[PDB]
Amino acid sequence: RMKNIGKNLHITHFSYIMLSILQVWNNYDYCSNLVSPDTEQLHDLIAHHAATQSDLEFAADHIIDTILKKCFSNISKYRFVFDQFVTDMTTVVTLPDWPVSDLILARLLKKLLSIFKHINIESVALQGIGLIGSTILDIRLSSNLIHLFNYPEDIDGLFKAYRTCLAYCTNSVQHHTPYKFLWCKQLDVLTKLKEMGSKLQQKFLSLIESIHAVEILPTYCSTLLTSELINMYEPYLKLVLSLLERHKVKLRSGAIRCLALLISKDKNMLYTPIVKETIENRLTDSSPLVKDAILELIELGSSYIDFYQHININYNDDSMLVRKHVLRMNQIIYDDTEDIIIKAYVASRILRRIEDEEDVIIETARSELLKRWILSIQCPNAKPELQIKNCRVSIRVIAQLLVGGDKICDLFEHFLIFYVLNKNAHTEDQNKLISSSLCLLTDQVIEMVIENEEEGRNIMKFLSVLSSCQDSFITKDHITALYPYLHSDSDFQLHILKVYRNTFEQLSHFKPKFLYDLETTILSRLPRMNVRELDEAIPLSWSLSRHRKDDTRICKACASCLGQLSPYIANATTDPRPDGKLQRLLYLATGFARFCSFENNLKTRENIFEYVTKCLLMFTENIHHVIRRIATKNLVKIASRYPKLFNSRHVLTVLDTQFEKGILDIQLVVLESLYDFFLAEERRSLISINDGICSALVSRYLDKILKICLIADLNNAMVAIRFLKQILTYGYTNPSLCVPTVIALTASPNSYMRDLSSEMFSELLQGYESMAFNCLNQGIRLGTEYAVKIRPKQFHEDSMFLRRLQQLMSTNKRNRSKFLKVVKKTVFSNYLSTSVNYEESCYHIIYLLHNLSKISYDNMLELYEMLRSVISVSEYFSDRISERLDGFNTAAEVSAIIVTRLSIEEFKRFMFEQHHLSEAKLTLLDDENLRNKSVAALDDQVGSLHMENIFLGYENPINNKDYCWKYISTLHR
């Protein structure tokens, strides 16, 4: 049973009648018979309309109350009498036939907002309130009274809009009191203005004077923007946004549906400050499913380019779901904006996802970059001139992308070499398009640099990456056109040299006149070039040498270089200094020696590289420190190209001298340079090889390299451990020479070293299990010594060294007890034996005792048998302290023994507290022992040893007479 209205619309009879009844609460009958403009009978009229309003406001409240209290008593049966009511009101608000409805919804919305009671109510209220909010926005979009306060101009226009709606009323159906009540809303706006002189009164009087379907909807809605209803929009908006933080899922989800409805009706919503702020806040601090929900809401607008920076907070989120979502939106942003710095930003995050745990996300990230940068260039849909315009934005984007990040450049080069130009990754038609597209792309890269002569030098960096490809698409006419800008001068010159160096190793048959003038330009500027461009120009000069089939000019530049050294080698056979010019000419002389390859020049018969080493040996401890470094660095670099030099007693005695004398800046360059040699060895075993020489070098310097891994300065220690890594994987040594050092490094407080160590040790465990166990002893000892050495005051803060080893190594019946047997032998044979000097070892014993607290003894017997042993050692120490004060410089040893005794005591007390633990089970031997083998144990943190019980507030207890006295005071108490 529902009642017909105009356009096939029904309402429950209850609401139909009730709205009819409340619309008689009006005062236009008073107003109509009022003829004379009695200034005294007008302020009378306001008191009667104000009475009419507060009355039916009270009446509206009380009907709103009872309906709710009835619906919310059993929110299981009356669902759709509540949702029927809200659907009735929202239906009729847009009609001038029913002007009281705006009041009803206004006070209904007030009461539902105050609910935010059982979730069954809240979620039902939450849906109705979303329907009310929805239609508030409907009205507001179709074609404002504090606005009238400032500009009373538009009060005239407002009643004009009313006048049309009253005109519309007259037509149909039973319209008498609808016209009436609607008329009094005109009088209503003016009394709400006076709430805030005679400018309203004459408008008031001229209204009293004037009593003698979807085309109106925009106009009628214009009147409703003065009402209370529409002005409740923002407090409703403020609420639903706040609901995105509530813990209850049905509120959050109901909030999502509320905003989804709003955003799809008005899309500029997202940028209104209140929602923008909340969306941005929820993207940082929220769960994965709320983050995804916020991202889907953003997606409901038209463009959301401005949100790009907050969207990508979660580009690397832990959730695959959110990572997939952000990737999808980075694509839309990229295709939407025309801004290069935006495109490169979002493309950077797409490119980063080619390294991802999910293979699906990889192929998505790869394909969409390939589609956009490569295959887009030759679209079946022409024209050609749009094609190059797409080509150029791609170049601008990539060039900007390559600016900044070493990581992102490596990712781009990987994407280019191992995906784009990998013909097994694509179909045959695609490889054709890729080859065609890249050809046109590199050509446009060239045109863009020449036309340009921060964009330009970034494009030149891109060109060098393209040039380093297998078969580049740079041609002889391209490299001819670039020649003017090899002369003119930042890193622009290094990159163009790269392009030349690489292209001349690929193209052949150049014009001889161009080859000649290029060879002049390079060899002229060789003196004034830095090291990194020499490492390109000198090989390029050699390439030009062979293209010319003429080596005379390269030799002339080389001999000129060696001549300029003759003053310094003369002053090297005497002695002092260096400054600016000698440095770059040792790099230049070395440069020639390694990249060429000529044989003869005009001084003494020789090989040029043998001459250059003899000069370098002259600068390798008399000579100034900064030049020896460069000389020794370059000497190893030459020996890397001619490994037979590593047999010379002269150069070896140079390497000998630098490893022992220990200076860190020289030692470092020796280590990286030798490291580069051993890496080159591996690359060339995967295709000359020289295993005997490398084994010779390992046998001499391995001892000293292992030492550098455990020194304090991590510059040398990092290069050393990476050197050691290469030595192991290639297999020059028996692994056991290195495993003690790798175990030791797992004790590092440094994050990188401790991680890098543990995978190397995991790697050696699978390959050589039983050998690693034979090295566990020395590993522990070098471990504790290293730990204590780096952090002398704070080493004890890491008690998990031995436990990390136990978890790595104890994955077996026999392995779990072998690790325990070794740890027991080490502690007692090496640290608590009579051969130990406790002055040197007390801090080591402390570090260990911590770690022995957090290991797992597997069963109670191994644990109880342990404390049995340490207490025996403790009482032993007690007897030896009792022998000292039993007859009194000797403070050093007693302090060391006191410290070591208290350490054992603190250990035993901590173990008793944290585990069980009973003196009664401890003191008794013998069935009862096997009754302890069958109870189990592991441990946690929980907390560490109390060190106040060992140091007794002393500094530095060792050789501290006050510390000794304090302990002695605690004996004869």
Numbering used by the authors: 423 to 538, 544 to 570, 577 to 629, 637 to 652, 663 to 903, 913 to 948, 951 to 1037, 1041 to 1064, ...
Sentences from the paper on this structure:
Functional studies have revealed that the in-vitro-loading activity of Scc2–Scc4 resides in the C terminus of Scc2, in contrast, Scc4 is likely a chromatin adaptor for targeting cohesin in vivo. To gain further insight into the molecular function of the cohesion–loader Scc2–Scc4, which has such broad implications for both chromosome biology and genetic diseases, we determined the large modular structure of C-terminal Scc2 and derived a pseudo-atomic structure of the full-length Scc2–Scc4 complex.
The 130 kDa structure of Ashyba gossypii Scc2378–1,479 was determined experimentally to 2.9 Å resolution by multiple isomorphous replacement with anomalous scattering. The 15th and 16th repeats form part of an oval-shape globular domain (GD2) with an extended loop folded back to the domain body connecting the capping helix at the extreme C terminus. These loops may permit considerable motion of the hook structure as suggested by the conformational variability observed in the Scc2 hook EM images. Sequence alignment and conservation analysis show that the Scc2 surface is relatively poorly conserved protein with only two highly conserved patches at the neck and base regions.
